Design a protein around this ligand. Structure first.
Ligand SMILES: *[C@@H]1O[C@H](CO[C@@H]2O[C@@H](C)[C@@H](O)[C@@H](O)[C@@H]2O)[C@@H](O[C@@H]2O[C@H](CO)[C@@H](O)[C@H](O)[C@H]2NC(C)=O)[C@H](O)[C@H]1NC(C)=O
Ligand SMILES: *[C@@H]1O[C@H](CO)[C@@H](O)[C@H](O)[C@H]1NC(C)=O
Ligand SMILES: [Br-]
Ligand SMILES: [Br-]
Ligand SMILES: [Cl-]
Ligand SMILES: [Cl-]
Ligand SMILES: [Cl-]
Ligand SMILES: [Cl-]
Ligand SMILES: [Cl-]
Ligand SMILES: [Cl-]
Ligand SMILES: [Cl-]
Ligand SMILES: [Cl-]
Ligand SMILES: [Cl-]
Ligand SMILES: [Cl-]
Ligand SMILES: [Cl-]
Ligand SMILES: [Cl-]
Ligand SMILES: [Cl-]
Ligand SMILES: [Cl-]
Lengths: 286, 285
């Protein structure tokens, strides 16, 4: 019927509730095509791992954040596979997006899909990547006051854990202090950053183009952590980037069909089944 | 728009020039959609990624294609699995028999839509084909029956090594038939023992088609031929044969790439699919 949801990469085993200044970076839009998908099997720390790197021009026109099963997915606490959501949205390239609660399925953190707020952070502060109507690519942390600005408002936005790069500099350490909570253990979260597994990320490059990353693997066995990931991205010319859901949620859909190897297993156990995720990251051409 | 052709797995570095029973499975008496299964399983203590496929009604769901459409081998053409599969609107497709990289010729007996497109030329290798009545053939055959008007072939291709016979491994028995005396004795045995990405084709007792794919790299990542054949046998394949592998190892699903090619691009950093000869296609009315 679906996945067994075994390969879990959880930043917080204890669900966070709804009860150092924090600012964000914005990159103006250079004036300007199809995406550029690149498959690879490269070595990190002596381990070969497979993944994908994507590039798109006109993020304001080719980028979109989708809800599980179409508009209103988060409002109904819905969960759908990247293929189902991508096939319905006719996305050239698609992969899983923000985090969620597996059992309930609601979308956690700020989320903007086509100028519509679908989820709110609720006082919590994590890494977020969004685009404003003027065409500026934003990354980092924003307050709900800035999120709600009606002058050059966000058109597409999602949130993830850790801010991977800021202005061409690694920003993991700066996120470890900001995005870590003290009520939960400090080593359950630090593992989420250091443990090896399949994960995804999103960012942009010096030329003003959107970037999407995906790496296959397994929790503790195969894949990469967040440290190894950022360096490869810097080698690829990304300015700002944030991490996204990974583990069994790591899914890369190309032309509406699965192109990655999910980490989770099927009920039959032998085979790997894609996970039903909340929001999806979509790239297309009108 | 082409591969760098770095990951080479050659059964014979020295090209052979132009100078025996088979098994057949009758059609059991009765059509579900194909079953594509992603996996990361352990072979000799190392995990490798791949796909395993199965289709019923091979007489109705199986097809052998030429690179870029009909006449591909006749024109010594080379095309990517995606290119050939997209034109045929195949749900599941992967590279097939071997070919000459320099010229582009298709090696071994090949039947695409009931027409012989290439001949073995006196050489004897493992072959998998289907006859119009529904009989599934595997092993070695003489040209008299191949072109015979008795249950003529509708789909046929050739590859190196016969992996399984009647639910039993036939590699040892195949090495004796498929061993050459002109080539060195260690290049071919390595071809069987070396670990890398390869593909295979076979069938089950119920009369269903099977297709296999395993990602990897020559000698670095993947599996050899010994580990590969058994995984299918544990899954209920009766007969199976090996197919082209290495940089040609490609799995295309619904017309799009779903595997990780071993070859590199001219840019070097990225991996590019290789342009192959014949392709195996699976679709539904
Ligand atoms: C490859 O593509 C097919 C999509 O094809 C269509 O889907 C349906 C409309 C059905 O009528 C098929 O015959 C069509 O050709 C995927 O198969 C299906 O997806 C749809 C979901 O919208 C579903 O209704 C079908 O039942 C699906 N078929 C199966 C076997 O599940 C197929 O999964 C695609 N493969 C991948 C990896 O995306
Ligand atoms: C798949 O990607 C290729 C890349 O060029 C594109 O040409 C093709 O249109 C895509 N598939 C569909 C159904 O659009
Ligand atoms: Br939470
Ligand atoms: Br040869
Ligand atoms: Cl600035
Ligand atoms: Cl590139
Ligand atoms: Cl290691
Ligand atoms: Cl609610
Ligand atoms: Cl979040
Ligand atoms: Cl495992
Ligand atoms: Cl569209
Ligand atoms: Cl091409
Ligand atoms: Cl090589
Ligand atoms: Cl196994
Ligand atoms: Cl296990
Ligand atoms: Cl071994
Ligand atoms: Cl692999
Ligand atoms: Cl003919």
């Amino acid at each position: 019927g679906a996945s067994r949801d075994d390969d879990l990469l959880v930043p917080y085993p204890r669900a966070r509730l709804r009860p150092g200044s924090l600012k964000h970076e914005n990159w103006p839009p250079p004036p300007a095509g199809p995406p550029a998908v690149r498959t690879f099997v490269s070595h990190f720390g002596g381990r070969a791992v497979s993944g994908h790197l994507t590039r798109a021009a006109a993020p304001l026109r080719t980028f979109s954040v989708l809800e599980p099963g179409g508009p209103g997915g988060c409002s109904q606490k819905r969960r759908a596979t990247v293929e189902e959501t991508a096939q319905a949205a006719a996305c050239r390239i698609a992969q899983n997006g923000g985090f969620f609660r597996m059992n309930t399925g609601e979308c956690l953190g700020n989320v903007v899909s086509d100028g519509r707020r679908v989820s709110s952070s609720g006082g919590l502060q994590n890494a977020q990547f969004g685009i404003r109507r003027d065409g500026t690519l934003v990354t980092g942390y924003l307050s709900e006051e800035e999120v709600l600005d009606t002058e050059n408002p966000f058109v597409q936005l999602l949130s993830g854990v850790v801010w991977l790069i800021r202005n061409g500099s690694i920003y993991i350490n700066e996120s470890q202090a900001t995005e870590c909570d003290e009520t939960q253990e400090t080593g359950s979260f630090s593992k989420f950053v250091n443990v090896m597994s399949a994960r995804t990320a999103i960012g942009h490059d010096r030329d003003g183009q959107l970037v999407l990353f995906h790496a296959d693997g397994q929790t503790e066995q195969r894949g990469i952590n967040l440290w190894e990931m950022a360096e490869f991205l810097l080698r690829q010319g990304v300015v700002n980037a944030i991490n996204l859901d990974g583990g069994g949620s790591a899914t890369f859909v190309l032309n509406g069909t699965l192109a990655s190897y999910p980490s989770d297993h099927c009920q039959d156990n032998m085979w790997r089944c894609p996970r039903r995720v909340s929001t999806v990251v979509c790239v297309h051409e009108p």
